[PDB]
Design a protein around this nucleic acid. Structure first.
Ligand code: MG
Ligand code: MG
Ligand code: ZN
Ligand code: ZN
Ligand code: ZN
Ligand code: ZN
Lengths: 162, 162
DNA sequence: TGGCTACCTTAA
DNA sequence: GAGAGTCA
DNA sequence: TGACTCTCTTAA
DNA sequence: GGTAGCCA
């Protein structure tokens, strides 16, 4: 349907509108006991959010553009990867926040990857903690840590071995 | 209701019946390019599963014991931790497989931790890969890796910075 | 018990 | 992390 | 376009 | 990953 040139047109209008979202400076742990700085372009909390942006859910938004009399809509974060495929190895791709900030829409803090790879980053040590992600992390997962496990493995008798 | 003495009674009857489940020897990656061995006590695929065991779902089971004329039922993997609390920092605890094998019921391959901690193990490098979990992992997550991310962060214009 | 049933909560 | 709809 | 509304997906 | 019902 849409032409490559028309797509690009969209992406570009996107980047502009997004470009004017307020910029927020965030200190994030990169790992290795090192701290870094990031800048998220966060969509407003309430309307108006932007030109062509709407909220379909609490932390959900959609971008909509009319072209040759037909309305087109996509996920507020799916645009930068409109030219990229929509499945890798049979796995549907989505937009993953590398900053772990939903409201943020900076494409530099985003990526196209499966739902599993996306979640994984949640527990990643960080680029400085030892991240091994093909597309490196810009920050250490917000869940990385030793955890708060209550009870470990244990048997009362001796009916088992490891 | 149930007394501590009564509880232990359960756990023991559990460990007993569980102890006779067929034992399966599995080779698993511990990380660091190292391989180890584990022994899972897998519940049968179909009935009969065991003494007081039933299937409430494809990969779901329940243990049931009658005591002083009142039936008691729990999750086939929750028993080992019946004396332990049911929430840490306000987070409900569950049973996490350290071997990542549902059918397995070996308490040496189990632990009581939040739902998030449980999931995190999924991407853990392993005890030999660099695991930092308070309650060490028995194997490296089955999802650990660089991933198959299709597109990385990128902007067409120059409206952004990291 | 034995053996099924149907329904539930998650963050992205 | 997604889809679609419906008033204006 | 503006601004609201709805249901879905996933394996733990 | 987890709670409960029904019928022999
Ligand atoms: Mg993410
Ligand atoms: Mg698990
Ligand atoms: Zn950001
Ligand atoms: Zn990473
Ligand atoms: Zn096991
Ligand atoms: Zn671990």
């Amino acid at each position: 349907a849409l032409t490559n040139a028309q797509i690009l047109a969209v992406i570009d209008s996107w980047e502009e509108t997004v470009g004017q979202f307020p910029v927020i400076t965030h200190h994030v742990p990169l790992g290795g006991g090192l701290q870094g700085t990031l800048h998220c372009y966060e969509i407003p909390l309430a309307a108006p959010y932007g030109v062509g942006f709407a909220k379909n859910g609490p932390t959900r938004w959609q971008y909509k553009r009319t072209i040759n009399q037909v309305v087109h809509r996509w996920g507020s974060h799916t645009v930068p990867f409109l030219l990229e495929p929509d499945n890798i190895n049979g796995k549907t791709c989505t937009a993953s926040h590398l900053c772990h900030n939903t409201r943020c829409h900076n494409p530099l803090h985003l990526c196209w990857e499966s739902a599993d790879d996306n979640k994984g980053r949640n527990w990643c040590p960080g680029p400085n903690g030892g991240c091994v992600h093909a597309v490196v992390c810009l920050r250490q997962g917000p869940l990385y840590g030793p955890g708060a496990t209550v009870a470990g493995p244990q048997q009362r008798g001796s009916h088992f071995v490891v």
